[PDB]
Write a protein that holds these residues in place. Structure first.
Motif, PDB file in Angstrom:
ATOM      1  N   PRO A  55      -5.239  -1.649 -13.629  1.00  0.00           N
ATOM      2  CA  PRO A  55      -5.732  -0.608 -12.735  1.00  0.00           C
ATOM      3  C   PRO A  55      -4.729   0.523 -12.557  1.00  0.00           C
ATOM      4  N   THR A  56      -5.178   1.652 -12.041  1.00  0.00           N
ATOM      5  CA  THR A  56      -4.284   2.754 -11.714  1.00  0.00           C
ATOM      6  C   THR A  56      -3.640   2.454 -10.339  1.00  0.00           C
ATOM      7  N   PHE A  57      -2.504   3.076 -10.081  1.00  0.00           N
ATOM      8  CA  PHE A  57      -1.886   3.077  -8.763  1.00  0.00           C
ATOM      9  C   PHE A  57      -2.761   3.677  -7.655  1.00  0.00           C
ATOM     10  N   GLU A  58      -3.651   4.580  -8.023  1.00  0.00           N
ATOM     11  CA  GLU A  58      -4.577   5.199  -7.086  1.00  0.00           C
ATOM     12  C   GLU A  58      -5.570   4.162  -6.617  1.00  0.00           C
ATOM     13  N   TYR A  59      -6.072   3.354  -7.556  1.00  0.00           N
ATOM     14  CA  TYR A  59      -6.944   2.218  -7.256  1.00  0.00           C
ATOM     15  C   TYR A  59      -6.248   1.139  -6.386  1.00  0.00           C
ATOM     16  N   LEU A  60      -5.120   0.603  -6.872  1.00  0.00           N
ATOM     17  CA  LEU A  60      -4.237  -0.301  -6.083  1.00  0.00           C
ATOM     18  C   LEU A  60      -4.012   0.182  -4.644  1.00  0.00           C
ATOM     19  N   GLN A  61      -3.656   1.454  -4.461  1.00  0.00           N
ATOM     20  CA  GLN A  61      -3.399   1.961  -3.129  1.00  0.00           C
ATOM     21  C   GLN A  61      -4.647   1.815  -2.251  1.00  0.00           C
ATOM     22  N   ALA A  62      -5.792   2.177  -2.813  1.00  0.00           N
ATOM     23  CA  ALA A  62      -7.050   2.181  -2.051  1.00  0.00           C
ATOM     24  C   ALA A  62      -7.437   0.758  -1.690  1.00  0.00           C
ATOM     25  N   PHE A  63      -7.311  -0.168  -2.655  1.00  0.00           N
ATOM     26  CA  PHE A  63      -7.644  -1.604  -2.445  1.00  0.00           C
ATOM     27  C   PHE A  63      -6.787  -2.233  -1.322  1.00  0.00           C
ATOM     28  N   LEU A  64      -5.515  -1.903  -1.325  1.00  0.00           N
ATOM     29  CA  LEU A  64      -4.576  -2.475  -0.355  1.00  0.00           C
ATOM     30  C   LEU A  64      -4.688  -1.764   1.012  1.00  0.00           C
ATOM     31  N   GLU A  65      -4.950  -0.468   1.017  1.00  0.00           N
ATOM     32  CA  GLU A  65      -5.171   0.254   2.287  1.00  0.00           C
ATOM     33  C   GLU A  65      -6.378  -0.305   3.042  1.00  0.00           C
ATOM     34  N   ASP A  66      -7.394  -0.722   2.277  1.00  0.00           N
ATOM     35  CA  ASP A  66      -8.681  -1.130   2.788  1.00  0.00           C
ATOM     36  C   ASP A  66      -8.828  -2.614   2.935  1.00  0.00           C
ATOM     37  N   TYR A  67      -7.804  -3.364   2.520  1.00  0.00           N
ATOM     38  CA  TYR A  67      -7.897  -4.804   2.313  1.00  0.00           C
ATOM     39  C   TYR A  67      -8.510  -5.663   3.445  1.00  0.00           C
ATOM     40  N   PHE A  68      -8.060  -5.450   4.676  1.00  0.00           N
ATOM     41  CA  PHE A  68      -8.553  -6.300   5.770  1.00  0.00           C
ATOM     42  C   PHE A  68      -9.902  -5.893   6.331  1.00  0.00           C
ATOM     43  N   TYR A  81       1.799   8.919  -6.832  1.00  0.00           N
ATOM     44  CA  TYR A  81       2.385  10.259  -7.014  1.00  0.00           C
ATOM     45  C   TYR A  81       3.159  10.383  -8.338  1.00  0.00           C
ATOM     46  N   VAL A  82       4.055   9.437  -8.582  1.00  0.00           N
ATOM     47  CA  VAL A  82       4.740   9.316  -9.861  1.00  0.00           C
ATOM     48  C   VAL A  82       3.727   9.382 -11.020  1.00  0.00           C
ATOM     49  N   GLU A  83       2.654   8.590 -10.914  1.00  0.00           N
ATOM     50  CA  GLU A  83       1.573   8.505 -11.895  1.00  0.00           C
ATOM     51  C   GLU A  83       0.898   9.870 -12.141  1.00  0.00           C
ATOM     52  N   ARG A  84       0.572  10.589 -11.057  1.00  0.00           N
ATOM     53  CA  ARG A  84      -0.018  11.940 -11.129  1.00  0.00           C
ATOM     54  C   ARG A  84       0.940  12.982 -11.712  1.00  0.00           C
ATOM     55  N   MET A  85       2.237  12.788 -11.485  1.00  0.00           N
ATOM     56  CA  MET A  85       3.251  13.705 -11.985  1.00  0.00           C
ATOM     57  C   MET A  85       3.629  13.391 -13.433  1.00  0.00           C
ATOM     58  N   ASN A  86       2.948  12.431 -14.047  1.00  0.00           N
ATOM     59  CA  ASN A  86       3.244  12.013 -15.421  1.00  0.00           C
ATOM     60  C   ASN A  86       4.668  11.495 -15.585  1.00  0.00           C
ATOM     61  N   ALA A 140       0.846  -1.214   0.000  1.00  0.00           N
ATOM     62  CA  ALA A 140       0.000   0.000   0.000  1.00  0.00           C
ATOM     63  C   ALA A 140       0.887   1.274   0.000  1.00  0.00           C
ATOM     64  N   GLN A 141       1.970   1.308   0.788  1.00  0.00           N
ATOM     65  CA  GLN A 141       2.904   2.477   0.738  1.00  0.00           C
ATOM     66  C   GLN A 141       3.632   2.624  -0.610  1.00  0.00           C
ATOM     67  N   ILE A 142       4.027   1.503  -1.194  1.00  0.00           N
ATOM     68  CA  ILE A 142       4.666   1.538  -2.520  1.00  0.00           C
ATOM     69  C   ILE A 142       3.683   2.104  -3.597  1.00  0.00           C
ATOM     70  N   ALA A 143       2.463   1.566  -3.612  1.00  0.00           N
ATOM     71  CA  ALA A 143       1.361   2.039  -4.482  1.00  0.00           C
ATOM     72  C   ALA A 143       1.097   3.540  -4.323  1.00  0.00           C
ATOM     73  N   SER A 144       1.184   4.052  -3.090  1.00  0.00           N
ATOM     74  CA  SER A 144       1.019   5.474  -2.804  1.00  0.00           C
ATOM     75  C   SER A 144       2.131   6.345  -3.437  1.00  0.00           C
ATOM     76  N   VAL A 152       8.466   1.418   7.201  1.00  0.00           N
ATOM     77  CA  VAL A 152       8.236   2.427   6.197  1.00  0.00           C
ATOM     78  C   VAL A 152       8.958   2.012   4.920  1.00  0.00           C
ATOM     79  N   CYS A 153       8.257   2.109   3.789  1.00  0.00           N
ATOM     80  CA  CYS A 153       8.770   1.738   2.471  1.00  0.00           C
ATOM     81  C   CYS A 153       8.705   2.960   1.578  1.00  0.00           C
ATOM     82  N   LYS A 154       9.757   3.167   0.798  1.00  0.00           N
ATOM     83  CA  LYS A 154       9.809   4.279  -0.146  1.00  0.00           C
ATOM     84  C   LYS A 154      10.413   3.832  -1.481  1.00  0.00           C
ATOM     85  N   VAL A 155       9.829   4.325  -2.561  1.00  0.00           N
ATOM     86  CA  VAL A 155      10.357   4.119  -3.911  1.00  0.00           C
ATOM     87  C   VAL A 155      11.668   4.879  -4.108  1.00  0.00           C
TER      88      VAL A 155
END
Length: 233
Positions: A207-220, A97-102, A89-93, A120-123
């Motif tokens: 899917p978009t990274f925005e979708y992935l992030q939301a799915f994984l944030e909400d998963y449990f 951002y990368v995705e939104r910044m084109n 979920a942190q990686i997707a987030s 904490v995970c960071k790209v």
């Protein structure tokens, strides 16, 4: 832009070279030897440079090294699905951002994610590359989504190489005929379903990274509210 004497270079981490060190005798930092536009909580942050030779690049220090080395290290055996989905979920987030910044990353995989404390995970490789990119050089944010599906198998296997037992040519051949990695042992089918969406043949249908992030944030709550820990996940 900073004074050269203000950087104490302590431990050599890898091979130019990468060092652990201190900046102004107070701030622990990573130091690269022979990113100003991108600023996000889930992207490794540039602190300073020395532009003239020898060139030095200074970034925030990520104390657990790469995700790949973290999952394969002493701590990996203790990670369970909740922590692994939280990491993804942190990686997707960061990738959202990368995705939104084109932007397009082009080498998204666990070797290229860095881990700090508190998980904490960071790209910051054919088997991680979408077929259209590997074959025709079409790298887009959607070919990064494919790489993200592959990265999810690294997470759920705690750091194994994807397509176990297959050489690059076999992988390229099989994936071209529709092959996709099966569900990892003890990984819920809903998470493998997500992998399979990232690996859709048509890039625009992934899917978009925005979708992935939301799915994984909400998963449990929304997808696996009945999750019980097993032997490994």
């Amino acid at each position: 832009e900073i004074p050269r004497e203000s950087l104490r270079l302590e431990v050599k981490l890898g091979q130019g070279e990468v060092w652990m060190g201190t900046w102004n005798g107070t701030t622990r930092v990573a130091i690269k030897t022979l990113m100003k536009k991108l600023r996000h909580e889930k992207l490794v942050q540039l602190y300073a440079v020395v532009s003239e030779e020898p060139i030095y690049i200074v970034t925030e220090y990520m104390n657990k090294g790469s995700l790949l080395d973290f999952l394969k290290g002493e701590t990996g055996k203790y990670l369970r699905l909740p922590q692994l989905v939280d990491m993804s979920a942190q990686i997707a987030s960061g990738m959202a951002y990368v995705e939104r910044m084109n932007y397009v990353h082009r080498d998204l995989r666990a070797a290229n994610i860095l881990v700090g404390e508190n998980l904490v995970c960071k790209v910051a490789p054919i088997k991680w590359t979408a077929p259209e990119a590997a074959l025709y050089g079409r790298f887009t944010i959607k070919s990064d989504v494919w790489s993200f599906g592959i990265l999810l198998t690294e997470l759920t296997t705690k750091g194994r190489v994807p397509y176990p037992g297959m050489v690059n040519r076999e992988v390229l051949d099989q994936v071209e005929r529709g092959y996709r990695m099966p569900c990892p042992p003890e990984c819920p089918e809903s998470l493998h379903d997500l992998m399979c969406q990232c690996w859709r043949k048509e890039p625009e249908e992934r899917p978009t990274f925005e979708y992935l992030q939301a799915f994984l944030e909400d998963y449990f709550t929304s997808t696996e509210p009945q999750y019980q820990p097993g032997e490994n996940l």
